[PDB]
Amino acid sequence: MKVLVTGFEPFGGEKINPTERIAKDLDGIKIGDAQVFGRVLPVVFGKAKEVLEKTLEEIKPDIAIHVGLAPGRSAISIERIAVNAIDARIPDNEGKKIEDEPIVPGAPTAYFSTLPIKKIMKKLHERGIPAYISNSAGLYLCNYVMYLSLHHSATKGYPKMSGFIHVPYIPEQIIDKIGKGQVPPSMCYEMELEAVKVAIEVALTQDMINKST
Amino acid sequence: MKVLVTGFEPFGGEKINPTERIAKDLDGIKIGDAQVFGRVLPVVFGKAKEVLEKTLEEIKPDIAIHVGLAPGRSAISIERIAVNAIDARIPDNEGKKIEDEPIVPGAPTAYFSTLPIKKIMKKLHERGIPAYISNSAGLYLCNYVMYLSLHHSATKGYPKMSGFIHVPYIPEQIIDKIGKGQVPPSMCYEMELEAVKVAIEVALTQDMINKST
Amino acid sequence: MKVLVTGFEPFGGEKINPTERIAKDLDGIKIGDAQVFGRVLPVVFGKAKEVLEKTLEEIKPDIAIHVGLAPGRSAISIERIAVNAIDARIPDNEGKKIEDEPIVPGAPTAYFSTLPIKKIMKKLHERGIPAYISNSAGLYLCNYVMYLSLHHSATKGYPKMSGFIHVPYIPEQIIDKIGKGQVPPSMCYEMELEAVKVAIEVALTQDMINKST
Amino acid sequence: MKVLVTGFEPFGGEKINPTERIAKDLDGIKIGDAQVFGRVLPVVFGKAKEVLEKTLEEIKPDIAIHVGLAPGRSAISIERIAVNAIDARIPDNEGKKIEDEPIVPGAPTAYFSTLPIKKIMKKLHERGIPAYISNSAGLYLCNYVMYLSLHHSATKGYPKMSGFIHVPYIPEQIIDKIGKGQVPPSMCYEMELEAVKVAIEVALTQDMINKST
């Protein structure tokens, strides 16, 4: 069993992106006999596609968990749906602001995550980690990668499990926001890394249950 | 030097109150040659005043930092003002819903905190802890306590430094909320505990400076 | 040209539903050369589908605009996508709380609204009415109706244009909210009524350009 | 009976200020035998104090209701207390930012509004207008005038009744805020105008405290 976890580089003027640290901390670890691979994706349309595709082909994971930063979000949120569209509110790190354009022409308008979102949310709660199910991952790069991942699964038969997880700003990222108006929510990095690691565990456990029953 | 740190017991159906854990964790601690005293207060008007007075009388702290829970707050908040009034929406842990009633008749309409709130907030940011100055501590028990402490300071000459700090919900407190509205913001306990400790450290440093000029 | 506009009855404890008045005020009042029908739907699973199917079959509208109440929303929001799922956070008006279930088994995971959402938003802005594109209509009855309507359109070829609009609370609804908890956003009825009429106008305009090529 | 109602000019970044319109629309009207005066204050420290002083001296109002814009607020708010301090987070219209500075040295730390705040909030509710009592009007220009007005009353004897009311953004102001991030709350100008007028009506009704056998 191989698990692929991805995070993103900094964007929107942000100095850092917590998901990038998460990808690095989990890269190369092992949960039982399962090997986890952590890779960081660029916040650039097209380029991120090429990288995601190349990484998936390379590793051929059984489970793919894509993590992204959700500014303003107060808790961990597991994405339920991926949409076949791009309507970036802001441009990507290359200055590309794509509006009302499909991700994969002719492909399904949307894909449901294949991760045990309910079970993942349940395990997080037992761990005292606030978490809820989100019904929209936006239409920027996070939804982009989540849709592509799920499309790959439906077209290539792998990864069997794929989904997306959004994490709040981490505390240190709010320091600057303070001297600029209001103050958005945050969650300590340690809790965010544990949440993602817990999603991996629940997925792996659910897989063993499927390949047996 | 003696420092009094207070916290509160659970209130409003809440299973816990992080300020209670904070008070107990800092009790009996020493910061340099200073002795910290941690005390838990009841969420009952009158009874809280009774305990506050006796505690201040018994210890005669040089510095008094009162901590409380502020549901919905997304960062640490240091109170700048205590108002001489009691107008609560929800009744205390007794059933008495006191509305429109002075805390101490004839006493000043408001008192300014005597803690170095600016220096405190500065250190918090350097430590990566999101904080800001609040210009209203409410008009419930938290403001009640902050007002009485400052009033005691002006009538008895001690403590020379008195203030109030509000802390966001703790992660595990958010679990019991997912079907209601948008998940409330939280801050991990460890960061809240450190935040209060830093306030004590900064207040201690400010005091050693007062005796120099 | 026939235009069908729907609203919902009261739910979630509220005494009224602004979308119900909107449907009633618009009913019968022609807009240009098109007839407008305003119908109210029940906030009940199953029953609302029957009522919806019957209304569409009866009228056979060229354009259907469904309106719903979105508590907590601060501006007009135009739904972009309908998802084939039901996961009520609260039960319907008959105590039914369906979880993790499709609306139409084997039907597309999701449908894109066929209304001129971007032009509707631009026009509303010119009229001084705050509006934005929402990427999730929730998974309660509003999404339920949105999906069924878009599915009908794909299955029967009509209505040619179908979409959903969410309106904030109206002022009078916030009154009893002020007491407990916080104060949710609202928008005066007159503006919400105007916004929906505007949407119809913009829809009618886009319809001509389509048939005129 | 002479009533004074003031509003402010556009602060900074806003092309308009609803209170400026309210002041102008209410100027000259009469409520029974009471005459209402509407004056607009500059958003500059010092200059605002000067203008406020001349205006009060000239008119010698029996009731003073100052109105200001509170971005983000979702309902009408009635200020309960004015604090003797200035802590600007943004430079004024002129170009001077003040941090921790008394408005009137030696003057009381705070002044309670002398308007029938409770009576006012109740009447607004009856009229279907969401409103609540605020316990902090900030420490910028709005608090500045509120304090000066209440100080003038206590030292010069007039106005007998003085207070402050904050109003949310009006719809048209949100339009440009939509292309930035989370859409802030708003309230139609018509309701804000009526809210202020209602505050006056209640203020005058309460002034009947001159009834005898």
Short mmCIF file of N, CA and C in Angstrom, two decimals, chain D residues 104-156:
data_model
loop_
_atom_site.label_atom_id
_atom_site.label_comp_id
_atom_site.label_asym_id
_atom_site.label_seq_id
_atom_site.Cartn_x
_atom_site.Cartn_y
_atom_site.Cartn_z
N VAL D 104 -9.72 64.12 27.09
CA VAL D 104 -9.77 65.25 28.02
C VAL D 104 -9.01 64.84 29.29
N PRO D 105 -7.77 65.31 29.45
CA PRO D 105 -6.99 64.94 30.64
C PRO D 105 -7.73 65.30 31.93
N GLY D 106 -7.68 64.40 32.91
CA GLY D 106 -8.36 64.66 34.16
C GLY D 106 -9.84 64.34 34.13
N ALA D 107 -10.42 64.30 32.93
CA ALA D 107 -11.85 63.99 32.79
C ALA D 107 -12.09 62.51 33.12
N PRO D 108 -13.33 62.15 33.51
CA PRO D 108 -13.66 60.75 33.84
C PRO D 108 -13.18 59.73 32.80
N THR D 109 -12.85 58.53 33.26
CA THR D 109 -12.37 57.48 32.37
C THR D 109 -13.44 57.11 31.35
N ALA D 110 -14.70 57.24 31.75
CA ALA D 110 -15.80 56.92 30.85
C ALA D 110 -17.07 57.65 31.23
N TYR D 111 -17.98 57.75 30.27
CA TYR D 111 -19.29 58.38 30.46
C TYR D 111 -20.33 57.44 29.87
N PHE D 112 -21.41 57.22 30.61
CA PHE D 112 -22.51 56.39 30.14
C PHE D 112 -23.41 57.28 29.30
N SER D 113 -23.96 56.74 28.21
CA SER D 113 -24.86 57.52 27.37
C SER D 113 -26.08 57.90 28.19
N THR D 114 -26.66 59.06 27.90
CA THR D 114 -27.84 59.49 28.65
C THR D 114 -29.13 59.35 27.84
N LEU D 115 -29.05 58.57 26.76
CA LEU D 115 -30.21 58.30 25.91
C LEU D 115 -30.94 57.09 26.50
N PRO D 116 -32.26 56.96 26.24
CA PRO D 116 -33.07 55.84 26.74
C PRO D 116 -32.73 54.62 25.88
N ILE D 117 -31.47 54.19 25.93
CA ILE D 117 -31.01 53.07 25.11
C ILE D 117 -31.90 51.83 25.11
N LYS D 118 -32.41 51.47 26.28
CA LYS D 118 -33.29 50.32 26.41
C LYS D 118 -34.59 50.61 25.67
N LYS D 119 -35.19 51.76 25.97
CA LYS D 119 -36.44 52.15 25.33
C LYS D 119 -36.26 52.18 23.81
N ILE D 120 -35.13 52.71 23.36
CA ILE D 120 -34.84 52.81 21.93
C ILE D 120 -34.75 51.42 21.29
N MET D 121 -33.94 50.54 21.87
CA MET D 121 -33.80 49.20 21.33
C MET D 121 -35.15 48.49 21.25
N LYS D 122 -35.99 48.67 22.27
CA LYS D 122 -37.30 48.03 22.28
C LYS D 122 -38.18 48.51 21.13
N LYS D 123 -38.22 49.82 20.91
CA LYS D 123 -39.04 50.41 19.85
C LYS D 123 -38.58 49.97 18.47
N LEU D 124 -37.27 49.90 18.27
CA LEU D 124 -36.75 49.48 16.99
C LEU D 124 -37.22 48.07 16.72
N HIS D 125 -37.13 47.21 17.74
CA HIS D 125 -37.56 45.83 17.59
C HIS D 125 -39.02 45.77 17.17
N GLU D 126 -39.87 46.54 17.84
CA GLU D 126 -41.29 46.58 17.52
C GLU D 126 -41.52 46.97 16.06
N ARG D 127 -40.64 47.81 15.52
CA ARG D 127 -40.75 48.27 14.14
C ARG D 127 -40.08 47.31 13.16
N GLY D 128 -39.61 46.18 13.68
CA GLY D 128 -38.96 45.18 12.84
C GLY D 128 -37.52 45.52 12.49
N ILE D 129 -36.89 46.39 13.28
CA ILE D 129 -35.51 46.79 13.02
C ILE D 129 -34.54 46.15 14.01
N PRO D 130 -33.64 45.28 13.52
CA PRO D 130 -32.66 44.62 14.39
C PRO D 130 -31.71 45.65 14.99
N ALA D 131 -31.54 45.57 16.31
CA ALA D 131 -30.70 46.50 17.03
C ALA D 131 -30.24 45.88 18.34
N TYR D 132 -29.08 46.29 18.82
CA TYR D 132 -28.56 45.78 20.08
C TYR D 132 -27.73 46.85 20.74
N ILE D 133 -27.41 46.65 22.01
CA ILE D 133 -26.61 47.61 22.74
C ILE D 133 -25.14 47.24 22.64
N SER D 134 -24.32 48.18 22.18
CA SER D 134 -22.88 47.96 22.06
C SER D 134 -22.22 48.50 23.31
N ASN D 135 -21.18 47.82 23.78
CA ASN D 135 -20.48 48.26 24.99
C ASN D 135 -19.12 48.88 24.69
N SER D 136 -18.89 49.19 23.42
CA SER D 136 -17.67 49.84 22.97
C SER D 136 -17.88 50.42 21.58
N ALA D 137 -17.61 51.71 21.46
CA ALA D 137 -17.79 52.42 20.20
C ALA D 137 -16.44 52.62 19.52
N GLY D 138 -15.47 51.81 19.91
CA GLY D 138 -14.14 51.94 19.35
C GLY D 138 -13.40 53.01 20.13
N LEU D 139 -12.26 53.46 19.62
CA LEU D 139 -11.48 54.50 20.27
C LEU D 139 -10.94 55.44 19.19
N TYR D 140 -11.75 55.63 18.15
CA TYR D 140 -11.40 56.48 17.04
C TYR D 140 -12.26 57.76 17.07
N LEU D 141 -12.70 58.23 15.90
CA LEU D 141 -13.50 59.45 15.84
C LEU D 141 -14.92 59.35 16.37
N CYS D 142 -15.56 58.21 16.17
CA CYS D 142 -16.92 58.06 16.65
C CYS D 142 -16.97 58.14 18.17
N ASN D 143 -16.03 57.46 18.83
CA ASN D 143 -15.95 57.47 20.29
C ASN D 143 -15.54 58.88 20.74
N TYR D 144 -14.68 59.50 19.93
CA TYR D 144 -14.19 60.84 20.19
C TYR D 144 -15.35 61.81 20.39
N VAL D 145 -16.21 61.94 19.37
CA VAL D 145 -17.35 62.85 19.48
C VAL D 145 -18.30 62.42 20.59
N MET D 146 -18.62 61.13 20.66
CA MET D 146 -19.52 60.65 21.71
C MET D 146 -19.03 61.10 23.09
N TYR D 147 -17.73 60.96 23.34
CA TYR D 147 -17.17 61.35 24.63
C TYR D 147 -17.28 62.86 24.83
N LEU D 148 -16.81 63.62 23.85
CA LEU D 148 -16.86 65.08 23.91
C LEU D 148 -18.29 65.56 24.14
N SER D 149 -19.25 64.96 23.45
CA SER D 149 -20.64 65.35 23.60
C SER D 149 -21.14 65.08 25.02
N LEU D 150 -20.80 63.91 25.55
CA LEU D 150 -21.24 63.54 26.90
C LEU D 150 -20.51 64.38 27.95
N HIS D 151 -19.27 64.77 27.64
CA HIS D 151 -18.50 65.58 28.56
C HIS D 151 -19.09 66.99 28.58
N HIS D 152 -19.45 67.49 27.40
CA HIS D 152 -20.05 68.82 27.28
C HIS D 152 -21.31 68.86 28.14
N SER D 153 -22.13 67.82 28.01
CA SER D 153 -23.36 67.74 28.78
C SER D 153 -23.11 67.84 30.29
N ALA D 154 -22.22 67.00 30.80
CA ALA D 154 -21.92 66.98 32.23
C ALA D 154 -21.33 68.28 32.77
N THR D 155 -20.57 69.00 31.96
CA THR D 155 -19.95 70.22 32.43
C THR D 155 -20.73 71.50 32.13
N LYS D 156 -21.42 71.53 30.99
CA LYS D 156 -22.18 72.72 30.60
C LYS D 156 -23.69 72.61 30.82
#
